[PDB]
PDB file of C-alpha atoms in Angstrom:
ATOM      1  CA  UNK A   1     -13.725  11.909  14.612  1.00  0.00           C
ATOM      2  CA  UNK A   2     -13.325  10.978  10.983  1.00  0.00           C
ATOM      3  CA  UNK A   3     -11.120   8.057  12.179  1.00  0.00           C
ATOM      4  CA  UNK A   4     -10.531   5.088   9.953  1.00  0.00           C
ATOM      5  CA  UNK A   5     -10.660   1.364  10.660  1.00  0.00           C
ATOM      6  CA  UNK A   6      -9.358   0.659   7.205  1.00  0.00           C
ATOM      7  CA  UNK A   7      -6.467   1.910   5.141  1.00  0.00           C
ATOM      8  CA  UNK A   8      -6.820   3.459   1.603  1.00  0.00           C
ATOM      9  CA  UNK A   9      -4.508   1.526  -0.612  1.00  0.00           C
ATOM     10  CA  UNK A  10      -3.789   3.453  -3.839  1.00  0.00           C
ATOM     11  CA  UNK A  11      -0.818   2.375  -5.757  1.00  0.00           C
ATOM     12  CA  UNK A  12      -0.119   2.362  -9.503  1.00  0.00           C
ATOM     13  CA  UNK A  13       1.670   4.008 -12.362  1.00  0.00           C
ATOM     14  CA  UNK A  14       1.688   7.887 -12.559  1.00  0.00           C
ATOM     15  CA  UNK A  15      -0.537   7.505 -15.610  1.00  0.00           C
ATOM     16  CA  UNK A  16      -3.417   7.034 -13.197  1.00  0.00           C
ATOM     17  CA  UNK A  17      -3.423   3.171 -13.399  1.00  0.00           C
ATOM     18  CA  UNK A  18      -3.512   3.178  -9.578  1.00  0.00           C
ATOM     19  CA  UNK A  19      -6.242   1.145  -7.895  1.00  0.00           C
ATOM     20  CA  UNK A  20      -7.544   2.784  -4.794  1.00  0.00           C
ATOM     21  CA  UNK A  21      -9.383   0.477  -2.494  1.00  0.00           C
ATOM     22  CA  UNK A  22      -9.993   0.177   1.274  1.00  0.00           C
ATOM     23  CA  UNK A  23      -8.352  -2.630   3.240  1.00  0.00           C
ATOM     24  CA  UNK A  24      -9.433  -3.257   6.891  1.00  0.00           C
ATOM     25  CA  UNK A  25      -6.542  -3.242   9.447  1.00  0.00           C
ATOM     26  CA  UNK A  26      -4.909  -6.681   9.658  1.00  0.00           C
ATOM     27  CA  UNK A  27      -4.458  -6.856   5.903  1.00  0.00           C
ATOM     28  CA  UNK A  28      -1.067  -7.580   4.410  1.00  0.00           C
ATOM     29  CA  UNK A  29       0.195  -7.504   0.868  1.00  0.00           C
ATOM     30  CA  UNK A  30       3.361  -6.955  -1.298  1.00  0.00           C
ATOM     31  CA  UNK A  31       4.498  -3.728  -2.876  1.00  0.00           C
ATOM     32  CA  UNK A  32       3.657  -3.823  -6.622  1.00  0.00           C
ATOM     33  CA  UNK A  33       5.478  -0.591  -7.734  1.00  0.00           C
ATOM     34  CA  UNK A  34       8.636  -1.397  -5.812  1.00  0.00           C
ATOM     35  CA  UNK A  35      10.675  -4.486  -4.976  1.00  0.00           C
ATOM     36  CA  UNK A  36       8.835  -6.734  -2.624  1.00  0.00           C
ATOM     37  CA  UNK A  37       7.937  -5.647   0.825  1.00  0.00           C
ATOM     38  CA  UNK A  38       4.899  -6.448   3.096  1.00  0.00           C
ATOM     39  CA  UNK A  39       2.581  -3.584   3.645  1.00  0.00           C
ATOM     40  CA  UNK A  40       0.839  -4.303   6.845  1.00  0.00           C
ATOM     41  CA  UNK A  41      -2.173  -2.090   7.718  1.00  0.00           C
ATOM     42  CA  UNK A  42      -1.929  -1.746  11.440  1.00  0.00           C
ATOM     43  CA  UNK A  43      -4.269  -0.131  14.050  1.00  0.00           C
ATOM     44  CA  UNK A  44      -2.443   1.314  16.834  1.00  0.00           C
ATOM     45  CA  UNK A  45      -4.896   2.321  19.686  1.00  0.00           C
ATOM     46  CA  UNK A  46      -6.667   5.067  17.750  1.00  0.00           C
ATOM     47  CA  UNK A  47      -4.150   5.478  14.961  1.00  0.00           C
ATOM     48  CA  UNK A  48      -4.496   3.516  11.828  1.00  0.00           C
ATOM     49  CA  UNK A  49      -1.730   3.502   9.288  1.00  0.00           C
ATOM     50  CA  UNK A  50       0.227   1.309   6.801  1.00  0.00           C
ATOM     51  CA  UNK A  51       3.330  -0.246   8.264  1.00  0.00           C
ATOM     52  CA  UNK A  52       6.091  -0.633   5.715  1.00  0.00           C
ATOM     53  CA  UNK A  53       7.884  -3.872   6.727  1.00  0.00           C
ATOM     54  CA  UNK A  54       9.932  -6.281   4.799  1.00  0.00           C
ATOM     55  CA  UNK A  55       8.762  -9.735   3.473  1.00  0.00           C
ATOM     56  CA  UNK A  56       9.045 -12.733   5.635  1.00  0.00           C
ATOM     57  CA  UNK A  57      10.962 -15.637   4.114  1.00  0.00           C
ATOM     58  CA  UNK A  58      13.304 -18.361   5.323  1.00  0.00           C
ATOM     59  CA  UNK A  59      17.101 -18.650   5.356  1.00  0.00           C
ATOM     60  CA  UNK A  60      19.093 -19.389   2.154  1.00  0.00           C
ATOM     61  CA  UNK A  61      20.706 -22.340   3.944  1.00  0.00           C
ATOM     62  CA  UNK A  62      19.830 -25.838   2.696  1.00  0.00           C
ATOM     63  CA  UNK A  63      16.894 -27.543   4.717  1.00  0.00           C
ATOM     64  CA  UNK A  64      17.590 -30.916   6.352  1.00  0.00           C
ATOM     65  CA  UNK A  65      16.677 -33.599   3.835  1.00  0.00           C
ATOM     66  CA  UNK A  66      18.065 -37.039   3.037  1.00  0.00           C
ATOM     67  CA  UNK A  67      20.570 -37.483   0.225  1.00  0.00           C
ATOM     68  CA  UNK A  68      18.611 -37.919  -3.030  1.00  0.00           C
ATOM     69  CA  UNK A  69      16.610 -34.810  -2.666  1.00  0.00           C
ATOM     70  CA  UNK A  70      16.259 -31.964  -5.208  1.00  0.00           C
ATOM     71  CA  UNK A  71      17.108 -28.543  -3.912  1.00  0.00           C
ATOM     72  CA  UNK A  72      14.411 -26.335  -5.366  1.00  0.00           C
ATOM     73  CA  UNK A  73      14.918 -22.592  -5.049  1.00  0.00           C
ATOM     74  CA  UNK A  74      11.409 -21.299  -5.659  1.00  0.00           C
ATOM     75  CA  UNK A  75       9.603 -18.287  -4.102  1.00  0.00           C
ATOM     76  CA  UNK A  76       6.562 -16.143  -4.964  1.00  0.00           C
ATOM     77  CA  UNK A  77       7.980 -12.889  -3.629  1.00  0.00           C
ATOM     78  CA  UNK A  78      11.365 -11.058  -3.667  1.00  0.00           C
ATOM     79  CA  UNK A  79      13.457 -13.154  -1.234  1.00  0.00           C
ATOM     80  CA  UNK A  80      15.659 -16.251  -0.895  1.00  0.00           C
ATOM     81  CA  UNK A  81      13.795 -19.538  -0.601  1.00  0.00           C
ATOM     82  CA  UNK A  82      15.028 -23.088  -1.383  1.00  0.00           C
ATOM     83  CA  UNK A  83      13.313 -26.261  -0.344  1.00  0.00           C
ATOM     84  CA  UNK A  84      14.355 -29.953  -0.640  1.00  0.00           C
ATOM     85  CA  UNK A  85      12.128 -31.937  -2.967  1.00  0.00           C
TER      86      UNK A  85
END
């Protein structure tokens, strides 16, 4: 068969600074080389591949908080995210 239950993640600079490591399906991470996107290793019946999907983040609209809050735009990944402090 030679069928995988894990994906081989190898991403890095062309110099050979790429880190190849196996992630079991169900693993998600952000694209390091590119802008930010969520690479979701999916197992579809007997097919196992990396699904290139975009990052999940909230709307840029201001969350409902009482006057006297501090709007804090702060996110870990490439997306819009502002919370009320």
